[PDB]
Each structure stands twice: as C-alpha cells, then as structure tokens.
Structure 1
C-alpha cells in the first residue's frame, strides 16, 4: 500500500503543508493576542488601589 501511495505523493505533501500552515497560524494567533507587550510587568506587593 505504501508503494501504491508513493505515486500519488504530491497529494499528502499538499495536505501536510496545509496542516502545518494551520498550526503555525494557531501559534501566530496566540502570540498576536497575548504578546501585545514584551516588558513583563508584575504587580506591586502593596494593593493600595
């Protein structure tokens, strides 16, 4: 079956390319939402707000 699938080849190369693009896009989405800033601020010990 692998030998027979060999002569298709380009089809699941295309599929893997598409899925990798999707995964990279997911990481991009999370970064662009949450990594708006880069200075990791932290709260002061005193909560005198």
Structure 2
C-alpha cells in the first residue's frame, strides 16, 4: 500500500515551487486519491 506525497515529491520544501505547482490545479489530489483507492482495494482484497 504505497502512498506518495505529491507536493513533497515534486516541490520538496520550496514555497515558490508549491505556488507554481498550485497552477496545475487538482493533479496532486487526483494522484493521492488514486493511491488511497489502491490501498483500500488491497485491504479489501485481503479481507475478502
């Protein structure tokens, strides 16, 4: 169950980089939601 911090991976400890990344909208949210979904799917798989 891997999880990746989008803003920390792309823009590690840089306020200006985070401000620039905010221009790209919800991409980071998409990736984090996808990874969370995968993790939940894995726990569901093991449970079932």
Fold similarity call, TM over 0.5: yes
Structure of higher CA gyration radius: 1
The number of aligned residues is 32
Higher helix share: 2
Unaligned runs of 5+ residues in structure 2 are: 1-16
Give the TM-score normalised by structure 1. 0.60
Unaligned runs of 5+ residues in structure 1 are: 33-49
How large is the RMSD of aligned CA atoms in angstroms? 0.8
Give the TM-score normalised by structure 2. 0.61
Higher relative contact order structure (alpha carbons within 8 Å, sequence separation ≥ 6): 2
